[PDB]
Structure formats: C-alpha cells, structure tokens
Amino acid sequence: GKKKVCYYYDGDIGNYYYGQGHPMKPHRIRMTHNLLLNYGLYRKMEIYRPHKATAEEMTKYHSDEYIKFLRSIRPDNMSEYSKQMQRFNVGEDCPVFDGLFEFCQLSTGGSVAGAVKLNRQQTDMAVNWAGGLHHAKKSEASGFCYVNDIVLAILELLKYHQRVLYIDIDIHHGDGVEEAFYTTDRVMTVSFHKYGEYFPGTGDLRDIGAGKGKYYAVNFPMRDGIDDESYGQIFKPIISKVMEMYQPSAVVLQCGADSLSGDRLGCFNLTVKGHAKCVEVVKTFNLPLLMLGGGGYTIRNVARCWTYETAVALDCEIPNELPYNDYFEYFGPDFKLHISPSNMTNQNTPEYMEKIKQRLFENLRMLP
Ligand SMILES: CCC(O)(O)CCCCC[C@@H]1NC(=O)[C@H]2CC23CCN(CCCCCCCC[n+]2ccc4cc(ccc4c2O)-c2cnc1[nH]2)CC3
Numbered sequence: 001g002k003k004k005v006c007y008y009y010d011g012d013i014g015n016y017y018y019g020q021g022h023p024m025k026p027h028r029i030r031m032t033h034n035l036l037l038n039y040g041l042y043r044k045m046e047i048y049r050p051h052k053a054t055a056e057e058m059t060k061y062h063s064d065e066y067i068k069f070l071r072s073i074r075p076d077n078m079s080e081y082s083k084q085m086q087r088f089n090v091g092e093d094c095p096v097f098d099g100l101f102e103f104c105q106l107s108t109g110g111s112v113a114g115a116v117k118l119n120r121q122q123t124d125m126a127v128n129w130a131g132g133l134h135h136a137k138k139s140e141a142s143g144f145c146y147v148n149d150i151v152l153a154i155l156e157l158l159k160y161h162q163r164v165l166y167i168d169i170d171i172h173h174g175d176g177v178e179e180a181f182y183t184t185d186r187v188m189t190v191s192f193h194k195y196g197e198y199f200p201g202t203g204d205l206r207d208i209g210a211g212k213g214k215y216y217a218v219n220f221p222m223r224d225g226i227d228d229e230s231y232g233q234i235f236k237p238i239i240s241k242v243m244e245m246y247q248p249s250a251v252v253l254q255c256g257a258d259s260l261s262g263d264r265l266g267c268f269n270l271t272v273k274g275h276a277k278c279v280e281v282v283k284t285f286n287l288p289l290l291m292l293g294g295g296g297y298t299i300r301n302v303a304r305c306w307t308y309e310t311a312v313a314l315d316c317e318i319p320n321e322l323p324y325n326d327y328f329e330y331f332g333p334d335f336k337l338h339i340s341p342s343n344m345t346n347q348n349t350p351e352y353m354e355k356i357k358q359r360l361f362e363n364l365r366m367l368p
Pocket residue numbers: 020021022023092093132133134135142143144145170172199256258265294295296
C-alpha cells in the first residue's frame with residue numbers, strides 16, 4: 001500500500017557553486033524542492049534537514065588523508081596544495097569551490113541519515129536528491145563527486161541488512177559504488193549506462209565482480225538514443241530476476257536524471273515517465289528503499305524528474321500543468337511537468353537489448 005516517505009533537504013544546498021561553465025548545478029536541488037513544495041507534496045512527507053556528516057563518518061570508507069585534504073582546501077589556499085590536488089584528482093571536473101567540504105557534508109548527511117531511518121524501521125522510503133555521487137573513490141574525487149555518500153549509506157544499511165541491492169539509472173556507470181563492493185556478496189551493484197567513448201570508461205558487460213563478489217556486479221551497457229519502450233522492456237525483467245535470485249533486504253536506487261532526453265551531457269532519450277517507471281518497478285517489491293539523486297545537467301528537466309519521482313514514492317497523482325513557483329520561467333515555453341522525447345535514433349536495436357538481457361540472465365543463473 002501507501003508508504004511512509006522521509007525526505008532530506010538543506011535550504012543552503014542550492015547556494016554551492018562549482019564555477020562558471022561547470023555543468024554540475026546544486027541549484028537544481030532547490031528548484032526540485034520548490035516545485036515539489038508548490039505541488040503540495042510537503043503535506044504527505046516527513047521533511048528533515050540532514051546533519052553535516054563528520055570527517056569521521058566519511059572515513060568509514062574514505063582515507064583519512066583524503067578527507068583531511070577535503071576539509072582543508074579552499075580557493076584562497078589552493079596554491080599551497082598543488083601536489084595533493086593532483087594526487088586526489090582535484091581539477092576541472094572536480095574543482096575547489098567555496099564551501100566544498102560543507103556541500104559534501106550535506107550531500108552525505110542526507111544519505112546516511114536516510115539509511116539510519118530505514119535501519120530503525122521508521123520509514124519505508126528515504127529520499128535525498130542531493131546525494132547519489134557515485135564516482136567518488138576511497139582516496140580520489142572523480143566526475144564531479146568528492147565523497148561517496150552512496151557507499152557510506154550502504155555501509156550503514158549493512159549494519160542491519162545482510163544483503164543490499166544497489167541500482168543505478170544515471171547515464172554514467174556507477175564505478176565508485178561498484179569498485180567499493182566489487183569483492184563482496186553483501187552488496188549487488190546493477191548499473192544501466194551508456195558504454196563506449198564515454199566517461200568513466202568502465203561498466204563493460206564482462207565486469208561481473210571478483211572473488212566472493214563474482215556474479216554480484218551487473219552492468220548493462222547501452223548506446224545512444226535509448227527510449228522509454230526499450231528501457232522499460234529490460235529494466236523490469238532484470239530487476240525482477242535480481243530480486244528473485246539475490247533476495248535483498250534493502251535497496252538503494254540512484255536516480256541520475258542525465259539519462260533523460262535533452263540532457264546537456266547525456267545522449268539518451270527517456271521521458272520523465274520512462275525514468276520514473278524505474279522507481280515504480282523498484283517500489284513494487286515493498287523493500288526498505290533509499291532514493292538518491294545523481295547527474296542531470298538540463299536543470300528544468302532534473303526538477304521535473306525528481307518532483308515526479310517524489311510523487312511516485314508518495315503514490316500521489318499530480319497534474320501536468322505546473323503550479324506557479326519561484327523558478328516558473330525556467331519551465332517555458334510549455335510550463336508542463338512531462339517532457340517529449342526527441343527524434344534521435346535509438347542505436348539500441350530490439351535484438352541488441354534482448355541479447356544483452358540474455359547474457360545478464362546467464363550470469364544471474366550463477367548465483368546460489
Ligand atoms: C553526478 C554523477 C554523474 O552524472 O555521473 C557525473 C558525470 C561526470 C562526467 C565527467 C566527465 N569527465 C570527462 O570526460 C573527463 C575526460 C575529461 C577531462 C576534463 N574535461 C574538463 C574540461 C573543462 C574545461 C573548461 C573548464 C571550466 C568549465 N567546465 C568545467 C568542467 C566541465 C566538465 C565537463 C564538461 C564541461 C565542463 C566545463 O565547461 C564534463 C563532461 N563530461 C565530463 N566532464 C572534460 C573531459
């Protein structure tokens with residue numbers, strides 16, 4: 001039936017700025033919040049302000065030296081850290097910006113707080129649109145991500161759950177999360193992503209885990225132009241087979257919106273309904289669920305996507321006509337919630353989709 005949903009948001013999150021021209025815009029988190037507030041979705045959720053995660057909470061995964069660096073570096077002192085910046089991959093993709101550490105603390109705080117709430121059985125779903133920063137590594141920033149809030153949230157869930165399933169629908173491969181749990185069977189990682197001449201370059205369908213983790217990493221490599229029909233055709237069957245074989249007791253779903261049509265960095269053709277169908281599929285299994293953000297670089301579409309996915313979590317129907325809001329002008333010229341796919345060619349033929357699905361099904365047969 002209808003579930004209890006807890007939502008994590010800090011009003012300061014939208015003020016963090018990666019710099020002129022940088023595609024990552026935390027302001028999209030504030031647009032999402034304002035849109036969902038104007039639709040009246042606040043009357044149905046418990047809204048919490050996450051704490052600022054401590055360096056100690058972050059070192060449950062990350063190295064002490066890397067977290068000390070993140071807590072110390074600032075634009076005014078960068079000149080003295082040229083050596084550590086290279087070592088930790090701080091540069092154009094992962095720049096030093098004012099309040100970088102506080103931004104990591106809020107992104108992380110929401111994911112860990114959500115995981116604690118799920119562990120205490122005080123909510124059915126926990127949502128943190130500021131999280132989902134899946135590329136961050138143990139001692140290195142990567143792909144606009146500095147602290148891997150997902151890995152930290154999963155480590156929290158592992159305190160009470162024997163098996164945790166991680167599903168990632170961002171257009172980029174969830175490499176940081178896959179790497180963290182690559183040799184364990186206590187987490188199964190499933191990523192659907194563009195593969196081929198695309199960041200981060202990992203996520204081949206032959207990457208299936210190692211040691212005790214063999215068969216516990218799943219990768220579905222895709223080409224440009226995937227649409228709702230094609231994505232829907234493989235997502236439910238793969239997730240149903242994973243649920244059947246793995247029997248997880250908690251799920252984490254990274255809802256990166258860069259897989260939508262018209263994304264500045266992505267080359268997929270999903271609509272908000274197509275993307276949200278993934279949330280409907282996962283929610284149907286009735287397991288404790290942590291829903292996180294991730295990519296999304298056409299910010300009006302990210303706000304639409306995550307507002308609609310919050311409505312899906314709440315089993316609340318909301319009109320296509322957008323309510324007036326603080327960023328109304330960003331949603332022109334139509335001022336509607338749902339989006340149309342483009343005329344781009346879908347390079348993922350129906351035969352390619354079925355063939356990759358069948359290869360993944362062979363690997364899933366290898367689980368105990
Ligand atoms: C949140 C989860 C997520 O959704 O999975 C995150 C997705 C991460 C994607 C990362 C990907 N990195 C690469 O493919 C690296 C191989 C690359 C090396 C670095 N250059 C950056 C050139 C920057 C030059 C201009 C400097 C200022 C403005 N600015 C900054 C960063 C930019 C990044 C991207 C596009 C313009 C910039 C610009 O215009 C950019 C696009 N794709 C990348 N970076 C690029 C090429």
